[PDB]
């Protein structure tokens, strides 16, 4: 179960933070490369599709963009991360 990193363990064997009562003890170059490589390469076609879906700017389109990114990348986590990165880039290009 869950422990506590402070407030020493309860000396009993069950429950929250149970157990023995021992004493516990406790950017420039990256986005320069990103900028130049972005200048050279641009966006992959599925990234362009996600960009346009984001730019459409309705809840239906954002849902569709998440679904499309999820299908294109596999996995909800990767799809969601791609969607947030593209939303950030769309905001930035809007400024």
């Amino acid at each position: 179960g869950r422990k506590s990193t402070i407030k020493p363990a309860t000396g009993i064997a069950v429950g929250f933070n149970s157990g023995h009562v021992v004493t516990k003890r406790n950017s420039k170059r990256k986005e320069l490369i990103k900028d130049v490589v972005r200048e050279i390469t641009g966006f992959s076609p599925y990234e362009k599709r996600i960009i346009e879906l984001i730019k459409i700017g309705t809840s239906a389109s954002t849902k569709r963009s998440l679904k499309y990114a999820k299908k294109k990348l596999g996995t909800h986590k990767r799809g969601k991360a791609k969607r947030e990165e593209i939303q950030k880039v769309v905001i930035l290009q809007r400024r």
Binding site: G11, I12, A13
Partner: protein
């Protein structure tokens, strides 16, 4: 060992004790546990009742160390400690023994048996049974939880 074998005492008896009629053939009923539910079903149901089917839910990877806990009943707590010290603790009423059964190798104290009347005893264990604790503090003792 080979000269004590029963086949030796049937040496000139033709059939070797296996019948002149039924003979000794090779797997006349099938191999291993073949005929259960079909032609060994009487044997299976008469000697191994609940053999077929499944009951319960799966535990995927067990890790027996997690739920390992050996038990001891209260009636052996006094016998855990030596005879002379038992006599000492009995004669002297102001002192009680404090026994950490976890050190002897027991994790849970169970409540079977009878503790000595008016003989206090403090027991340290990881787990306690309800009746074990009831008896321990009925004889004037105490249960201490350790881990």
């Amino acid at each position: 060992a080979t000269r004590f074998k029963k086949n030796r005492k049937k040496r000139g008896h033709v059939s070797a004790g296996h019948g002149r009629v039924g003979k000794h053939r090779k797997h006349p009923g099938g191999r291993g546990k073949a005929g259960g539910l079909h032609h060994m079903r009487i044997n299976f149901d008469k000697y191994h009742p609940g053999y077929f089917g499944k009951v319960g839910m799966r535990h995927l990877n067990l890790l027996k160390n997690r739920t390992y806990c050996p038990t001891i009943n209260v009636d052996k707590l006094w016998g855990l400690l030596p005879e002379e010290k038992k006599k000492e603790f009995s004669e002297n009423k102001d002192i009680a023994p404090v026994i950490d059964v976890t050190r002897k190798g027991y994790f849970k104290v169970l409540g079977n048996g009878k503790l000595k009347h008016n003989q206090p005893i403090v027991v340290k264990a990881r787990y306690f049974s309800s009746v074990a604790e009831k008896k321990i503090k009925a004889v004037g003792g105490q249960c201490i939880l350790v881990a």
